[PDB]
Amino acid sequence: SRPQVTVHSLTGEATANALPLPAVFSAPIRPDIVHTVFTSVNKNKRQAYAVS
């Protein structure tokens, strides 16, 4: 039973509707795995450099 999530309006006041957690927020949080994945994926947008 995901507890609830309050929904806000563009005017800043909470609306009547409330939604459950999408059950992905309960996934394990692994700082180590994210750190390794981030290190590799951040290298994907790179341009080659070389001396003549």
Binding site: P28, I29, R30, P31, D32
Partner: protein
């Protein structure tokens, strides 16, 4: 001076505080290091060490292996402890209604256990159930079945899988392997 009998400042050589930085795993180590300190049950000390082991030292344990252990006399209702991962086995067709505790359950293995009426349990839930390992059973996967162990200790008259990239005819099946060509091994 001191006529030293043995090497000084020598490490114990046994891994403690496993070098993996899995924060959840460290919590499990944090839990059991408290148990083994203040429970005096030999089960806790065994499990604590088993958490430190490396990947090769934590071979997968098949569900078929679980079935064999439960078939032992007077072990049907015991709780199975697997410090590692549990892999599904399609070679088996009957599974009992046991409960098992393991670090990881593969999707196939977890489905098989649940479909058999049992439940998959994490190590912490075991601790609250059996703080001193009441009625438990620890299983270990095979270590020598690794491919790398085949080449270990290669030498004359040993037959220990010489390291090779490509296998087949004319790849190390000549002089030195048969008496028609020089000698045999």
């Amino acid at each position: 001076g001191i006529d030293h009998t043995s090497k000084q400042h020598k490490r114990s050589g046994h891994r403690t505080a496993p070098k993996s930085d899995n924060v959840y795993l460290k919590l499990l180590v944090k839990l059991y290091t408290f148990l083994a300190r203040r429970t005096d049950a030999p089960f806790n000390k065994v499990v604590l060490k088993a958490l430190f082991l490396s990947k090769i030292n934590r071979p997968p344990v098949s569900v078929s292996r679980i079935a064999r252990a439960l078939k032992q006399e007077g072990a049907a209702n015991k709780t199975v402890v697997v410090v590692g991962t549990v892999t599904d086995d399609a070679r088996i067709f009957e599974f009992p209604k046991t409960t098992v505790a393991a670090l990881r359950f593969t999707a196939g293995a977890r489905a098989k256990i649940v479909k058999a009426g049992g439940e998959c349990i994490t190590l912490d839930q075991l601790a609250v159930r059996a703080p001193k390992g009441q009625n438990t059973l620890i299983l270990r996967g095979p270590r020598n079945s690794r491919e790398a162990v085949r080449h270990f200790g290669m030498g004359p008259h040993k037959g220990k899988a010489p390291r090779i990239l490509s296998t087949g005819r004319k790849f190390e099946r000549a002089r030195g392997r048969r008496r028609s060509k020089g000698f045999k091994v």
